[PDB]
Design a protein around this ligand. Structure first.
Ligand SMILES: [Ca+2]
Length: 134
């Protein structure tokens, strides 16, 4: 048994809050929107890792005009610079969060709103999926 790449749908994962919504352009046809209205609000996801090792981290979100800017932490550790999820067009936003080493077990992926693009109308996180690339 070696590490396999996996896609974990935000609407299927256990999360601390967030509303499940349908969208024909979302992975799985659904997403989970965290309706943050300002900074320091956070949503937690429980993310299983069956095999210890190194992974590249990819986030898929919806492209909405009120997407915020988020700091990912894993198990309380900052991962990556804050990721600004505002784009001017498109159906989805896909972002590369770099590499980590993850132990075997279930990890806490915390998304904290830390700001928003000046063009954005809000602070929200319409997360579609988390993809762990071995
Ligand atoms: Ca999805």
């Amino acid at each position: 048994t070696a590490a396999v790449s996996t896609r974990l749908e935000a609407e299927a994962l256990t999360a601390s809050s967030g509303v499940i919504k349908s969208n024909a352009d979302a992975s799985g046809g659904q997403y989970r929107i965290f309706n943050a209205y300002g900074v320091a609000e956070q949503i937690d996801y429980a993310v299983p890792v069956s095999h210890a090792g190194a992974y590249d981290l990819v986030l898929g979100t919806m492209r909405f005009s009120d997407n915020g800017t988020y700091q990912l932490q894993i198990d309380g550790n900052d991962v990556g610079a804050p990721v600004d999820l505002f784009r001017p067009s498109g159906k989805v936003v896909v972002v590369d969060l770099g590499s980590v080493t993850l132990s075997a077990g279930v990890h806490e992926f915390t998304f904290t709103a830390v700001g928003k693009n000046t063009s954005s109308l809000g602070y929200k996180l319409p997360l579609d999926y988390i993809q762990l690339v071995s």
